[PDB]
């Protein structure tokens, strides 16, 4: 599980400014996190199809956020990915 | 008419989550290791749902019977 610690570590880590809890960058960061824990959990458990739908929704939501991000500030975009690891 | 006295009233406060308080749990079983319905336990959807789980654990820890022979008859 993602502990409060690990989480808020990411939040600050990507936050646009002091107190930034839900910006495209933060959100995309948190999603990326979960997507990885989950994608991992499914390497083992090839048959947990129910959770897989979760993953599918998470990825989708991320795709949308980024799509919007790039649409708005294409720079913040290139930055986010690189920093994270997306597009890969 | 399931109107004698709900096992709840005939009992002080207690932690429904206690899987070892035999003396208390025992109260919720019948003349058999069967879990009394709510008309009997006098509990409630949420409570009863706990009681049950608790009772099962006690069962496994050889602390509560899964079943008993019926007398009288």
């Amino acid at each position: 599980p993602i502990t409060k610690e690990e989480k808020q570590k990411v939040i600050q880590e990507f936050a646009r400014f002091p107190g930034d809890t839900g910006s495209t960058e933060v959100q995309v960061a948190l999603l990326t996190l979960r997507i990885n824990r989950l994608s991992e959990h499914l390497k083992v458990h090839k048959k947990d199809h129910h959770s897989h739908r979760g993953l599918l929704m998470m990825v989708g939501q991320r795709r949308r956020l980024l799509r919007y991000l790039q649409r708005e500030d294409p720079e913040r975009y290139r930055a986010l990915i690189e920093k994270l690891g997306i597009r890969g | 008419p399931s109107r004698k006295a709900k096992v709840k009233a005939t009992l002080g406060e207690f932690d429904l989550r206690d899987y070892r308080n035999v003396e208390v749990l025992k109260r919720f079983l019948s003349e058999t290791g069967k879990i009394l319905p709510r008309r009997r336990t006098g509990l409630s959807g949420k409570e009863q749902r706990i009681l049950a789980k608790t009772i099962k654990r006690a069962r496994i820890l050889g602390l509560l019977p899964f079943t008993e022979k019926l007398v009288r008859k």
């Binding site: - | 009992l11 002080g12 406060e13 989550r17 206690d18 654990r57 820890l61 050889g62 019977p65 899964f66």
Partner: protein, 101 residues
Amino acid sequence: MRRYEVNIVLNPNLDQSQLALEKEIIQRALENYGARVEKVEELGLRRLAYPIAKDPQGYFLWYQVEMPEDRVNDLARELRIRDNVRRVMVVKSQEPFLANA
């Protein structure tokens, strides 16, 4: 980590030597698995609701530990090994749910 409750029931026919012996293997067990004992209860011999291993009685324990979740399962894999240990139930600690209180 997390707060667990380890219940153990063993042979009620153990002499103070045998009894103190298993409690030793248990202690090392807990230890070798990062289990830090917060407190302990030992009700001792109690009347089972039904025989367990032909025996009509049981000697109960109750070690409340704090250990790594990633090893609770493995911890019990070991505890059940003792021939006199005839019951091991590790439960997650939970706030008591009062009622009619």
